[PDB]
Amino acid sequence: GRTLGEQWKEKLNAMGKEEFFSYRKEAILEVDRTEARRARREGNKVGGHPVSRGTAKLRWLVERRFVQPIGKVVDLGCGRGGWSYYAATMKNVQEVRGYTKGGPGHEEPMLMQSYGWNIVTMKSGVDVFYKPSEISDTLLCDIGESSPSAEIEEQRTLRILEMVSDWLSRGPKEFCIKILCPYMPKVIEKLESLQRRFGGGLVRVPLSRNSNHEMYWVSGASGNIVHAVNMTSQVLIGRMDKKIWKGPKYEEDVNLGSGTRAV
Numbered sequence: 001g002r003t004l005g006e007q008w009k010e011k012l013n014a015m016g017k018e019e020f021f022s023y024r025k026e027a028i029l030e031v032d033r034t035e036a037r038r039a040r041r042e043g044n045k046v047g048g049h050p051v052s053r054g055t056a057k058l059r060w061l062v063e064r065r066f067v068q069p070i071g072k073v074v075d076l077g078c079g080r081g082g083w084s085y086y087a088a089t090m091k092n093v094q095e096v097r098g099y100t101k102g103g104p105g106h107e108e109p110m111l112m113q114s115y116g117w118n119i120v121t122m123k124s125g126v127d128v129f130y131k132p133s134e135i136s137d138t139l140l141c142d143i144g145e146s147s148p149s150a151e152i153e154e155q156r157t158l159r160i161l162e163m164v165s166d167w168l169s170r171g172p173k174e175f176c177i178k179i180l181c182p183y184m185p186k187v188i189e190k191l192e193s194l195q196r197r198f199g200g201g202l203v204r205v206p207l208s209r210n211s212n213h214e215m216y217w218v219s220g221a222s223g224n225i226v227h228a229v230n231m232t233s234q235v236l237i238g239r240m241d242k243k244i245w246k247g248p249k250y251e252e253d254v255n256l257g258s259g260t261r262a263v
């Protein structure tokens with residue numbers, strides 16, 4: 001046969017617009033960004049409004065001890081820097097280094113003055129697939145591009161998995177990696193291998209939209225991957241074909257404050 005996630009991806013692509021858009025936000029957690037937008041507009045950089053939604057995503061993991069940034073932090077595919085700035089707010093972090101592709105169709109790093117910004121250093125024009133690995137205490141990675149093909153998503157995920165190992169072999173004991181397509185059998189066996197060597201486990205962040213099955217490979221987690229995935233697949237499938245769409249659960253975004261920090 002084929003995996004539950006496999007079937008999810010097929011059932012997903014067969015939905016109408018009205019159904020899709022309505023489904024992808026059903027029962028999910030969502031951050032209110034409207035004030036972030038206002039700040040952005042006005043150019044206010046010291047109101048603690050994150051640069052993206054991803055800040056709230058990482059916060060969700062961190063607060064549940066799934067990952068706990070420490071020492072030198074490296075954020076691969078940092079984009080605007082939601083994850084980088086958030087790591088810089090934490091007392092145990094001393095150095096935040098981010099890398100992202102930039103250019104056409106890609107998010108450029110964004111300057112904010114959230115608490116700790118001064119130890120953040122983001123660099124654009126960098127393709128992590130050709131960037132020599134560096135030492136780190138914490139390794140973050142949030143790379144992964146959607147596609148209506150699960151096979152595409154598979155190989156994309158596999159390329160990512162292949163490359164993150166090199167960064168991990170450098171001894172960071174705290175980590176968080178986006179697995180774009182975790183439900184595919186080749187991805188699973190690869191994670192099964194990587195889990196044996198590096199530990200950790202896979203976790204679904206409820207802030208992620210129902211239109212994607214992304215899970216995060218995190219060092220503060222553990223346990224059976226194949227079960228973990230399937231559970232998420234039953235939830236996501238369980239949300240389909242709904243009667244009265246209740247919509248998302250709105251939460252307040254994280255406040256990263258302002259000002260520098262001496263290290």
Ligand SMILES: Nc1nc2c(ncn2[C@@H]2O[C@H](COP(=O)(O)OP(=O)(O)OP(=O)(O)OCC3O[C@@H](n4cnc5c(N)ncnc54)[C@H](O)[C@@H]3O)[C@@H](O)[C@H]2O)c(=O)[nH]1
Pocket residue numbers: 033036040051052053054105106107110
């Ligand atoms: N190459 C393309 N990328 C796109 C397109 N539409 C959206 N995106 C990007 O996908 C990403 C996911 O979109 P989502 O809306 O979920 O991103 P976030 O929710 O994390 O950003 P928010 O700031 O919370 O609000 C989202 C957006 O607000 C816009 N935004 C937010 N910040 C900016 C800046 N700095 N410069 C230009 N536009 C910005 C942007 O269009 C996003 O859709 C995001 O980086 C977008 O820039 C698109 O049509 N083409």
Ligand SMILES: Nc1nc2c(ncn2[C@@H]2O[C@H](COP(=O)(O)OP(=O)(O)OP(=O)(O)OCC3O[C@@H](n4cnc5c(N)ncnc54)[C@H](O)[C@@H]3O)[C@@H](O)[C@H]2O)c(=O)[nH]1
Pocket residue numbers: 012013014015016017020024105146147148149209211212
């Ligand atoms: N039945 C349908 N299925 C769809 C449809 N669109 C996408 N999909 C399926 O859902 C999957 C994911 O959908 P989504 O696009 O919501 O993916 P994400 O939420 O993970 O993308 P994000 O980057 O998190 O933000 C999403 C979006 O931001 C926009 N975005 C982001 N990147 C881009 C680019 N490069 N170009 C144009 N627009 C872009 C776009 O409007 C998306 O809704 C996708 O792989 C498809 O299998 C659709 O219209 N109908």
Ligand SMILES: C[S@@+](CC[C@H](N)C(=O)[O-])C[C@H]1O[C@@H](n2cnc3c(N)ncnc32)[C@H](O)[C@@H]1O
Pocket residue numbers: 051052053054055076077078079080081082083084099100101102105106107126127128129142143144
């Ligand atoms: C969506 S962002 C992740 C969000 C970020 N963690 C945050 O909190 O805002 C992922 C980024 O990885 C970048 N990316 C994709 N492929 C890359 C590559 N090969 N090398 C470096 N960055 C890449 C994309 O430009 C994209 O903006």
